[PDB]
Design a protein around this ligand. Structure first.
Ligand SMILES: [Mg+2]
Ligand SMILES: [Zn+2]
Lengths: 244, 100, 386, 136, 455, 42
RNA sequence: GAAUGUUACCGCAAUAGUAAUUGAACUUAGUACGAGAGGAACAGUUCAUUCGGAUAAUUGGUUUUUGCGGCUGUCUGAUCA
RNA sequence: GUGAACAGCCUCUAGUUGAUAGAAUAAUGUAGAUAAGGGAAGUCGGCAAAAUAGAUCCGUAACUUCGGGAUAAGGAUUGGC
C-alpha cells in the first residue's frame, strides 16, 4: 500500500526514481537508503536497479516506461543502456529515442494500456513509443499544462492530477484514459503530482511531507488498500470539506 | 566512450577534445578542433569545403556507400553482451578493417 | 589609518627568498620516518618529466556525485629507467645535526657518473676512480673495514644511485647522482642490502606501484626577471600612471623609513624548488611490456608515446611512472619521486583506479588520431601511397 | 549550494557577473532578468560576484509584466553561454544565457521551461528538472 | 505574530543593560584622543562616541519593543490570556515606558550632538560627552522595574501554550480533580500531572490527536467553582475565558463518587451556572470514575439531576473511567463527530469516471507471494542498507552493481566491455548473428577476387 | 571549520591511521618487498 | 664575486620566514528533544568561498612561423611568380 | 593609375640611402594592436579606447523667425564576368 519515503533530503520521489509494475529504477546518489526503502516494500519480487542517465540522478524524469518496455533519452550512454538491459529481464523492451525533447518522464505520462504525450512530440517518436509500450497514444494537455509527465500521475488502478485541473478537463481525461482521476496535491500542497511520488498497480511511494489527507486521497484514488477502490473516498468527502 | 564523428569533417572526436555546441533547437553539434567550430560560427558550408569529408562524399571520393560501412550503424538495441558475441565482434571488426 | 578595508596579502611569505634554486636537481629536505619493522626498501627514485596526457577512468568514490562515472583528468608522464646503486653513505647522529661518516663505491663507476666528475670530459685524461677501485685488491680489507665502521656507528644509511641517462632520449650524456635514504630496521641489514645491490639495477616497480601516493620535488619552470604584476599578482594601475602602471605604487610611508621585506617587489620568477605532495599514481608501465598504453578496455597494441613523439621529448622505450595532476619542472628536467612521508591512505588514496582509456594522440598540434593506423584508415590511401 | 539546492555543486565557469541581463526561460511572463546579486557568492576585494549554470541568484525583471517590475526575486540560471569543462571530458556552451525565477525553496513559478536546460542545473534542482521538457 | 511567540529577545535589567551598552561603546569605538589633535578631530571623536551609545540604546529598545506580541489586536483569546496573566494594564504601561525612554534617549543624543558640534576645547567636548552618557544612564536607571517585570513576562509568554482558535479543538470542563488531566493524558500523548490534590493543573495544557485523518487538539483547564464570578481567581478566569472565546466543543466532566467532595447537586448547579457559556459549544456531559459508581446503580432522586441536565437540547451523557480507558476512545469519537458535523453545517453557509469511453490491473505472482517486511523480526531480509552498514556504512561501502544484474551465465558476470577497438567502438558493432553477415561479406569478397576486382 | 592543528580532528585522523589506513600501507610495502627481492633474484 | 693547497661530487644545518582559511551534502535524521510547530550533536564520507605553489593533459586568448589561403590600389609587358 | 577631389597609396623624369652601430629580446616604459563570458558593475566624472564613416535607394519628428532642423532619426545594397 501507500508508504512514505524520502530521498537524501528531497520529497520528489519521481525525480530520482521510476517505479513500474515489473521493475523499479533508483539513483546511485549518496547511499542505499532509497534502495533499501524500495526493498522494504518490493523486496526481491521484482528487479531493483541502480542506474544513472546522462550522469545524473534525475533518471526518473529522463526516462518513461511501463511493464512492456522502457524508454531512455538520446543523451544516455551505451554503458547505462547495457547495464539497464542486463539488470532487467528480456520481457522488458529497452530502446533509445531520438527527438528534440529529452525529458521522457516529463514529456510522456503513460500506463500499461494508455499513454499521454507532449503535443509537439514528433510522429516517429510517437510511433516508436506506441510500438514499444503496446499502449494507445493521445495528444492531450492537463487543463493547459503541456508537461503531462510532471503534473499528472497515472496507473492502471487510477490517476492523479494537479489541483488546477478543471472539472471538465478531468472528466474528459478520465474518459480518454479509461481510468478515474482526482484533483489533489502531494508533498504538502505541491502541484507537481507526477514528480512528488511514484505509483504502480500495487505500491505507492510519496514524500514524507505528504499530509495524512493527501495520503488517504492517494490511497482511495489509486485503489491500493484492500476493499478501498475509491469506496472510502465518499467518507473522505466530509474530511476534505472540513479541511478545505 | 561514445567517440563521435565530427559534425563538420566527420573525424573522430575523442574524449576531452573539441567543443560541443547546443542550439536553442536542442541540436548538439560537436567540433573536434577550433577550426571546425570557427567555420561553423562563420556559417561555412561543409559540403563546399574541399577539406571536409562531407564534400568528398558527394564529390565521388572515399565512396560513401559500401557493405562494410553498414556494420558501424549506431544501434540502439542493448544486446545482452555475450562474451562469445563480444569476441566475435572483435574478430569481425578486425576483418572488416582489412576488407574496408 | 587602518586601510578602511581588510584584504589578504599577495604571495606566500614562507616561500621567500624567491631566488633561483641552488642546482637543477632539487635535494630532498626530509625522508620518510624509518620503520624498523618493515623490510629494507628504497625510499625515493629519480625520473625525467616526459610530458603530459589525458586519462579517463571510471571513478569509484562512494558519497561523491561522480560515483560510477568516467571523470577525465590530467596526468604527468615521467621517464624513469631503472636506477643502479653505485655506493652507500653512512650518517652518525651528532649534537649538531646528522654528519656523514664515510662513503663506499662499488669498485666500478659507470661512464655516466664519471662524466659527472669532470666539466671538460673530452679533454680530461679520464683518471677515474681507478685508485679507489684498487682498494678492492686481493684482500679488500679497506672496503670491509669501512663497511664495518658504517655498521658500528651509522644511525641511518643512504644509498648512492644515478639514473641511466643513456637509456633516456635526452641529448645529454652526463647522468645525475643523488643519495636516497634506506628504510627498515637492522641498520646492518641496510648496508648488507646495499652491498648486495652494488652495481645492480633497481626498477621503479620495486619502489612504487599503482594507487601509491608519492610526493614530487623538482625545480620549477624558470621565467627570468619578472614584473611584480605577475610575480605577485599585484593589481594593475588604471592607465598611463606616472612611473608606469604595472608596479606597486606605494612602497612605504613616513614611518618606518625603510622598505619592508614583505612589500613583494619584482624579481626573479620561477626556477625555485617546490614540494608537491599527495600525487596519486595511476599507471606503472613496464619498459618491455608492449602496448603500455593499452588498458583493459582499449586493449589496442599501442604504446603511451604520443603520435610523432612527445613535444620536446623522445620516444620513451623503458619503464615509466604515471601520476595524476601536474608536477613542477619542465620536460627534460629530472624529477625525484618521494614517498608521502606519512600514512596518506585517505579514501582519495585508498580508492583503486581503473583507466578506461589512455590518450596517445599527437600533442604536436590538434592531433585527431591516436595511432598512424587510424589516420591511414580515416584518410585512406594518398597520392604517394600509389 | 545553499537552501533549496540538493547535494554538492562542482565549480564551473562563472559567465554571469552581477548586473548581467539574461533572457527569461519560464512562462511566468518575464522577458529578461537583471542580476543584482549572486547567492552564495564569495567575498573578496574588488571581485564582482558571478553566477553560473545551476546557481541561485536574485534578479529584477527589466521587461515583461508590470506586476513583476520594481521587485527583486530569486532566480536559477538554466543557460550560461560560456564554455565550461564537463567532467565527461567535453567543453560545451549554450546559444544564449537564460534563467528562471524561483522562490527561496527552489520551487518553480512558471508551469513550463522553454529551451534547453543545462544538465548541471537540472540535476541540482529537482523542480527545474520536473518543469524542464528539454535537458541539454 | 501568534502561535508560540518563543523568539522574543531576552532583555537584561536596567543595570545590566546599561553596563553592557557602556562596555560595548568603550570597546568597539576608539578611546585614544590627545589635546594636540585638531579641535575638529576631538569633536568628531566625541560625537561618534555619543552617537554609538545612542544607537546601541535605540537598537536595544527597538528590539525589546518588536519582540513582544503587541497584545492589542492580536486575538481575543490570546489578548485575554495575556491580560489575565501579565495584568495587561501594567504590561502596556511598561512597554510604553520603554518606548518613551527610547524617544528620550534619541532626543538627548541629538541635542548633545548638536551642542558638541560647537565644541571649543578638549575639556568642553569631554564634559559634553560625559553629560550625554550620564543622561542616558539616568534614563536607563529609571527603567529598573519595567525591565525586570518584562523579563519575567517574556519568559512566561515564551513558556505559554500556543493553541490555534480557528482549528477544531476539544475542551474539558468540570470540578478540579474530576479527571480532566487523566482524560487529557489518556486521549492524547501529553505530559500532565494526574495527582488527586485540589488544583493539579495551574494553567492550560494542550494535547494533539488525529481522528479520521483530521488534526485535533485537546485542551485541559484547571476548572471553575460555584462562585458567581463576582470573586474569582485568575486560574478560574483563564478557564472561563478559554471556554468563552474558543470555538472548541466543551465537555463537562462529572464525578459521582465520594471524591471531589462537591456533590452531584453542586456539579449540576455549576453546569447550570456555566450554561450561558455552553450555548454554542455543542456540549457533552462525561461521567468519569464510572468504575466505582456505575451510575446505573444511582438513586432515582440523584438521577433527577442528570435528567434535568439532559433537559438542555445539545447535551449528552457519556460514561468513562480512568482505569477503564476504553471509553476515552468512544468519548473522543463522539466529540469529533459533533464538532465535524457542526463545522460542516457552518461551512456551506468528487471524482471522475471512465464512462467506458480490455484493460485490467496487473500484479506479478512474486508480489502476491511476497511476505510483509518486519523491521523488528530477527529473520527479516538482508537489508542491503544493513549490508552497507556492516561494510562501513554510507560513504565507505562500494556497491558492486554487477552483483545483481542478470546475465546468461554468472561465470562471466564480472567482465569488462572493451568499448573501443582502434576506432569504430565495439558497441556500434554489437549485434547478434555476426556470423551471417561475416559469411555474406566473405562470399562477396570471394566473388570479387575471382572476378578480378583487385588487379 | 577546524584547522590542521585541531586536536579533535588530529585524534580522529590518528585513530583512522591505526585503523585499516596503516594496514593498507603495510600491505603495499609487503608487496613492494617481493619485487625488491625479485630484482636481485632475476 | 677574490680570499679557507686547487677542481669536482655528495651532504649536515646555526640562523631568517612560514599557512592555509571558511562554508555546505549525505549518513547519524525527521532520531534525542515536541502537545504540536519544528529540529540536535560526534565518528566516516563528498563538494564548495578566499588565499598560496605549480603545469598546458583538454578549452579559450595571443601571431613575425608573416606558416598556409583569399582581397583593394599600384609596379615588374601578359601568366606564373 | 586608383580614386568626387592639388583627399590617402604605387609608379614615371628628377633628387637622395642622410638620422653612430653590432648581439639577445629580462622587468619597467615610448607608439600601434588582439581577447572567452558580463557591457561602465571602475572612476568625482563614459578620462582614454571602441563603435556609424564614401556612394545609391526607402524615409525623415518636436520646434521655427517658415529661411532651417536634415546627412535628423530609423532601414536595404555595394565584388567579378
Ligand atoms: Mg488532577
Ligand atoms: Zn572536425
Amino acid at each position: 500500500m501507500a508508504t512514505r519515503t524520502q530521498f537524501e533530503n528531497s520529497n520528489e520521489i519521481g525525480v530520482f526514481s521510476k517505479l513500474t509494475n515489473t521493475y523499479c529504477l533508483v539513483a546511485v546518489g549518496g547511499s542505499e537508503n532509497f534502495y533499501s526503502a524500495f526493498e522494504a516494500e518490493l523486496g526481491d519480487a521484482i528487479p531493483i536497479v541502480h542506474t544513472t542517465i546522462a550522469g545524473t540522478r534525475i533518471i526518473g524524469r529522463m526516462t518513461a516506461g511501463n511493464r512492456r518496455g522502457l524508454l531512455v533519452p538520446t543523451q544516455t550512454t551505451d554503458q547505462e543502456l547495457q547495464h539497464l538491459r542486463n539488470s532487467l529481464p528480456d520481457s522488458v523492451k529497452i530502446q533509445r529515442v531520438e527527438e528534440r525533447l529529452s525529458a521522457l518522464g516529463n514529456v510522456i505520462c503513460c500506463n500499461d494500456y494508455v499513454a499521454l504525450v507532449h503535443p509537439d512530440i514528433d510522429r516517429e517518436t510517437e510511433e516508436l513509443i506506441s510500438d514499444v509500450l503496446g499502449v494507445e497514444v493521445f495528444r492531450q494537455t492537463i487543463s493547459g499544462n503541456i508537461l503531462v509527465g510532471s503534473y499528472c500521475s497515472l496507473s492502471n488502478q487510477g490517476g492523479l492530477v494537479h489541483p488546477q485541473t478543471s472539472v471538465q478537463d478531468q472528466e474528459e481525461l478520465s474518459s480518454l484514459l479509461q481510468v478515474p482521476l482526482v484533483a489533489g496535491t502531494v508533498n504538502r500542497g505541491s502541484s507537481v503530482v507526477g514528480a512528488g511520488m511514484v505509483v504502480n498497480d500495487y505500491l505507492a511511494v510519496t514524500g514524507l511531507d505528504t499530509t495524512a489527507p493527501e495520503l488517504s486521497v492517494i490511497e482511495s484514488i489509486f485503489r491500493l488498500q484492500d476493499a478501498q477502490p475509491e469506496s472510502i473516498s465518499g467518507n473522505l468527502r466530509d474530511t476534505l470539506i472540513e479541511t478545505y | 566512450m561514445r567517440i563521435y564523428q565530427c559534425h563538420f569533417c566527420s573525424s573522430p572526436c575523442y574524449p576531452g577534445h573539441g567543443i560541443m555546441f547546443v542550439r536553442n533547437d536542442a541540436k548538439e553539434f560537436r567540433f573536434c578542433r577550433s577550426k571546425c567550430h570557427k567555420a561553423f560560427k562563420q556559417r561555412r558550408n561543409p559540403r563546399k569545403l574541399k577539406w571536409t569529408k562531407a564534400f568528398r562524399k558527394a564529390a565521388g571520393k572515399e565512396l560513401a556507400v559500401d557493405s562494410t560501412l553498414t556494420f558501424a550503424q549506431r544501434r540502439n538495441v542493448p544486446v545482452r553482451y555475450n562474451r562469445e558475441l563480444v569476441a566475435t565482434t572483435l574478430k569481425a571488426m578486425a576483418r572488416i578493417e582489412e576488407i574496408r | 589609518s587602518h586601510r578602511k578595508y581588510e584584504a589578504p596579502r599577495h604571495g606566500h611569505l614562507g616561500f621567500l627568498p624567491r631566488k633561483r634554486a641552488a642546482s637543477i636537481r632539487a635535494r630532498v629536505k626530509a625522508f620518510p620516518k624509518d620503520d624498523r619493522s618493515k623490510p629494507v626498501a628504497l625510499t625515493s627514485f629519480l625520473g625525467y618529466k616526459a610530458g603530459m596526457t589525458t586519462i579517463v577512468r571510471d571513478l569509484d568514490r562512494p558519497g561523491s556525485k561522480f560515483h560510477k562515472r568516467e571523470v577525465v583528468e590530467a596526468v604527468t608522464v615521467v621517464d624513469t629507467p631503472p636506477v643502479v646503486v653505485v655506493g652507500v653513505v653512512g650518517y652518525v647522529e651528532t649534537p649538531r645535526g646528522l654528519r656523514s661518516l664515510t662513503t663506499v663505491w662499488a669498485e666500478h663507476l659507470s661512464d655516466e657518473v664519471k662524466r659527472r666528475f669532470y666539466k671538460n670530459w673530452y679533454k680530461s685524461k679520464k683518471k677515474a676512480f681507478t685508485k679507489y677501485s684498487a682498494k678492492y685488491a686481493q684482500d679488500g680489507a679497506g672496503i670491509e673495514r669501512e663497511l664495518a665502521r658504517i655498521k658500528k656507528y651509522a644511525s641511518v644509511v643512504r644509498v648512492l644511485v644515478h639514473t641511466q641517462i643513456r637509456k633516456t632520449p635526452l641529448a645529454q650524456k652526463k647522468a645525475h647522482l643523488a643519495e636516497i635514504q634506506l628504510n627498515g630496521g637492522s641498520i646492518s641489514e641496510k648496508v648488507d642490502w646495499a652491498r648486495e645491490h652494488f652495481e645492480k639495477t633497481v626498477a621503479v616497480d620495486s619502489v612504487f606501484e599503482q594507487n601509491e601516493m608519492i610526493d614530487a620535488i623538482a625545480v620549477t619552470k624558470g621565467h627570468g626577471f619578472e614584473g611584480v604584476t605577475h610575480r605577485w599578482g599585484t593589481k594593475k594601475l588604471p592607465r598611463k600612471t606616472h612611473r608606469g602602471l604595472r608596479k606597486v605604487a606605494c612602497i612605504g610611508a613616513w614611518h618606518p623609513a625603510h622598505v619592508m621585506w614583505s612589500v613583494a617587489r619584482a624579481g626573479q620568477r620561477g626556477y625555485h624548488s617546490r614540494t608537491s605532495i599527495n600525487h596519486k599514481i595511476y599507471r606503472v608501465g613496464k619498459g618491455d611490456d608492449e602496448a603500455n598504453g593499452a588498458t583493459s578496455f582499449d586493449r589496442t597494441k599501442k604504446t603511451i608515446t604520443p603520435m610523432g613523439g612527445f613535444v620536446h621529448y623522445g620516444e620513451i622505450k623503458n619503464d615509466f611512472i604515471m601520476v595524476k595532476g601536474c608536477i613542477p619542472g619542465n620536460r627534460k628536467r629530472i624529477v625525484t619521486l618521494r614517498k608521502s612521508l606519512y600514512t596518506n591512505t585517505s579514501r582519495k588514496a585508498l580508492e583503486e583506479v581503473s583507466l578506461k582509456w589512455i590518450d596517445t594522440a599527437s600533442k604536436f598540434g590538434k592531433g585527431r588520431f591516436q595511432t598512424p593506423a587510424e589516420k591511414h584508415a580515416f584518410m585512406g590511401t594518398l597520392k604517394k601511397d600509389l | 549550494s545553499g537552501n533549496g539546492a540538493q547535494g554538492t555543486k562542482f565549480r564551473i565557469s562563472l559567465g554571469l557577473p552581477v548586473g548581467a541581463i539574461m533572457n527569461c526561460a519560464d512562462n511566468s511572463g518575464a522577458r529578461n532578468l537583471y542580476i543584482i546579486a549572486v547567492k552564495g557568492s564569495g567575498s573578496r576585494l574588488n571581485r564582482l560576484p558571478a553566477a553560473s549554470l545551476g546557481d541561485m541568484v536574485m534578479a529584477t525583471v527589466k521587461k515583461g509584466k508590470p506586476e513583476l517590475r520594481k521587485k527583486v526575486m530569486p532566480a536559477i540560471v538554466v543557460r550560461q553561454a560560456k564554455s565550461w569543462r564537463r567532467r565527461d571530458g567535453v567543453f560545451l556552451y549554450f546559444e544564449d544565457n537564460a534563467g528562471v525565477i524561483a522562490n527561496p525553496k527552489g520551487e518553480m513559478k512558471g508551469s513550463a521551461i522553454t529551451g534547453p536546460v543545462g544538465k548541471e542545473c537540472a540535476d541540482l534542482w529537482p523542480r527545474v528538472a520536473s518543469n524542464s521538457g528539454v535537458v541539454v | 505574530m501568534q502561535l508560540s511567540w518563543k523568539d522574543i529577545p531576552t532583555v537584561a535589567p536596567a543595570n545590566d543593560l546599561l553596563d553592557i551598552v557602556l562596555n560595548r561603546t568603550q570597546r568597539k569605538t576608539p578611546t585614544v584622543i590627545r589635546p594636540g589633535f585638531k579641535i575638529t578631530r576631538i569633536r568628531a571623536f566625541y560625537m561618534r562616541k555619543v552617537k554609538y551609545t545612542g544607537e546601541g540604546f535605540v537598537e536595544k529598545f527597538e528590539d525589546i519593543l518588536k519582540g513582544f506580541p503587541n497584545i492589542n489586536d492580536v486575538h481575543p483569546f490570546h489578548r485575554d490570556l495575556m491580560d489575565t496573566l501579565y495584568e495587561k494594564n501594567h504590561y502596556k504601561i511598561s512597554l510604553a515606558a520603554i518606548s518613551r525612554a527610547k524617544s528620550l534617549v534619541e532626543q538627548v543624543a541629538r541635542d548633545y550632538v548638536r551642542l558638541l558640534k560647537f565644541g571649543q576645547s578638549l575639556f568642553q567636548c569631554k564634559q559634553l560627552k560625559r553629560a550625554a552618557l550620564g543622561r542616558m544612564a539616568t534614563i536607563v536607571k529609571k527603567l529598573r522595574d519595567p525591565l525586570a517585570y518584562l523579563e519575567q513576562v517574556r519568559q512566561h509568554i515564551g513558556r505559554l501554550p500556543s493553541i490555534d482558535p480557528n482549528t477544531r479543538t476539544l475542551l474539558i470542563c468540570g470540578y478540579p480533580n474530576v479527571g480532566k488531566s487523566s482524560f487529557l493524558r489518556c486521549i492524547t500523548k501529553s505530559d500532565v500531572d494526574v495527582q488527586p490534590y485540589a488544583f493539579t493543573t495551574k494553567s492550560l495544557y494542550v494535547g494533539h490527536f488525529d481522528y479520521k485523518y483530521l488534526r485535533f487538539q485537546a485542551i485541559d483547564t484547571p476548572g471553575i467553582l460555584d462562585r458567581p464570578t463576582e470573586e474569582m481567581n485568575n486560574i478560574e478566569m483563564q478557564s472561563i475565558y478559554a471556554i468563552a472565546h474558543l470555538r472548541s466543543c466543551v465537555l463537562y466532566f462529572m464525578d459521582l463518587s465520594e471524591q471531589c467532595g462537591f456533590t452531584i447537586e453542586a456539579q449540576v448547579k455549576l453546569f447550570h451556572s456555566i450554561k450561558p457559556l455552553f450555548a454554542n459549544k455543542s456540549v457533552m456531559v462525561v461521567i468519569n470514575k464510572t468504575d466505582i459508581i456505575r451510575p446505573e446503580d444511582l438513586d432515582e432522586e440523584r438521577a433527577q439531576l442528570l435528567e434535568s441536565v439532559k433537559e438542555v437540547p445539545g447535551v449528552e451523557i457519556m460514561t468513562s473511567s480512568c482505569q477503564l480507558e476504553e471509553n476515552v476512545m468512544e468519548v473522543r469519537n463522539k466529540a469529533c463527530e459533533k464538532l465535524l458535523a457542526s463545522r460542516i453545517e457552518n461551512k456551506l453557509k468528487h471524482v471522475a469516471q471512465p464512462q467506458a469511453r480490455k484493460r485490467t490491473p496487473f500484479i506479478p505472482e512474486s508480489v502476491k507471494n511476497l511476505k510483509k517486511y518486519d523491521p523488528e523480526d530477527p529473520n527479516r531480509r538482508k537489508l542491503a542498507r544493513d549490508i552497507e552498514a556492516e561494510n562501513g556504512g554510507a560513504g565507505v561501502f562500494n556497491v558492486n552493481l554487477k552483483d545483481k544484474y542478470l546475465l546468461e551465465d554468472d561465470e562471466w558476470k564480472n567482465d569488462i566491455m572493451p568499448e573501443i577497438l582502434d576506432g569504430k567502438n565495439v558497441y556500434d558493432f554489437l549485434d547478434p548473428e555476426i556470423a551471417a553477415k561475416l559469411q555474406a561479406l566473405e562470399e562477396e569478397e570471394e566473388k570479387l577476387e575471382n572476378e578480378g576486382f583487385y588487379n | 571549520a577546524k584547522s590542521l592543528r585541531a586536536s579533535s580532528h588530529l585524534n580522529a585522523k590518528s585513530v583512522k591511521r591505526r585503523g585499516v589506513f596503516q594496514k593498507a600501507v603495510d600491505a603495499r610495502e609487503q608487496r613492494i618487498s617481493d619485487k625488491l627481492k625479485e630484482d636481485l633474484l632475476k
